[PDB]
């Protein structure tokens, strides 16, 4: 590598230790913010290595703990196309975080064949967290020691940062993603939303809970750029970004999804169309209060079916339904009714994949148009190289033209790099405008099987080894046989159990034709899992 550089890395590394042991995973490095200096430093070094390995391409760093409380923070790497860090590279981060101050960077330059000829290039941003300023200061020191070029994008949503990274590495290519600034992002979405909305009108207000996080001021700033006669009026609530303690506190998409209620502080009336973003605004879900005051959730799987229905219809009327392979990508947690709706009502393939955004993104990129959402409200619609060409180059034999126009627009509206709450929100709004649907008519599209999720503490969960999109247990022996036996005893009975990646428990999900059936099925399986976890 270099000797004078290797002395600057060792010297600047001055920070803690702090003796806990780390692992970069699904969520990158994510912990209490006080444990994090040596780790963010290491990611500075790892961003440098990654940039150089990929011929001095821009690598992103996002500083965020997402839905976690204020005391928490995290750090994530973004690869050139705006994808999360390639899986094989997570271990490199791990080695660098644990490995003691004083150098070891050098050992990886040899191991990963990395060219010194290019300077590393790295963009970063952060959410509203209290530790962000100091953590960025750390990141800067690591990128000064390795003589990397870097740009501080300051405060951004997670999807904005991914946007920038994609833009920077696609400028001058055939598939230019846009202007690599915050301004660029808003401009792209506003112009796409004007096109997608041509001749159609939003009805009623949308009350968006912004989790008191970065998504609130960024949404408000996007609203300045949006066009005029769309009918869209957004009411922003929970934007107390000023107070670090307010982040994700009894509001946000994660609260609303996991607790199955509107935020306590919500002032929405009966029939007000509502949504919640998470803290870093890459998760959204809709909800409304019944004509009879019952809370009604329209989660990621519900956005997935809404999107697929709309995209299905457009591809048809655009005359390209046959040329392009369209699909919905789901996990096992997707309500069986959602799957049934996709396959029997929309006549589209559903692919079930492992839990984890990587796996859903990967499966979606196998369709020309791949809709993938998790229930928690993370997801997007993937457009393939092939999809983009045939939308841009099919000649309309009918005024079809309108539909192609609408579809081209959608490719610009829908964030391709990462699932994006603000993007998804405008998507939903555009769909319900085009379809002329209320929240009530969206909900009425099919009925969810009553379902139950349970968290089952065992010691230890590593004996729970699954396959077939995590819908079957190979280990421990006999448990799947019991689970299969149990589910049969109930009408439309479906249940599966898997180790959590993020928590120390196995999760049981169950659904059946009725509330008491689902509940009892879930409990029997939970009991069976506890016995098997002894
Ligand atoms: C960025 C990413 O890949 N996130 C995944 C998410 O896709 C998955 O739904 C969740 C499942 O959690 P679990 O293993 O505890 O059920 O874990 C992670 O947060
Ligand atoms: Mg998030």
Author numbering: 2 to 14, 16 to 20, 22 to 105, 109 to 405, 407 to 541
Paper quotes:
Previously, AGM1 was shown to be an essential gene in the human fungal pathogen Aspergillus fumigatus and has been proposed as a drug target.
We also determined the crystal structure of AfAGM1 in complex with GlcNAc-6P and magnesium, showing the typical four domains forming a heart shape found previously for other members (domains 1–4). Domains 1 (residues 1–187), 2 (residues 188–305), 3 (residues 306–442), and 4 (residues 443–542) bear the predicted active serine loop, the metal-binding loop, the sugar-binding loop, and the phosphate-binding, respectively. The phospho-AfAGM1–GlcNAc-6P–Mg2+ Michaelis complex reveals a semi-opened active site and may represent the active complex. For this complex, it was observed that GlcNAc-6P made hydrogen bond interactions with residues R505, R514, S507, T509, G508, E380 and V363 from domains 3 and 4 of the protein but not with any residues from domains 1 and 2.
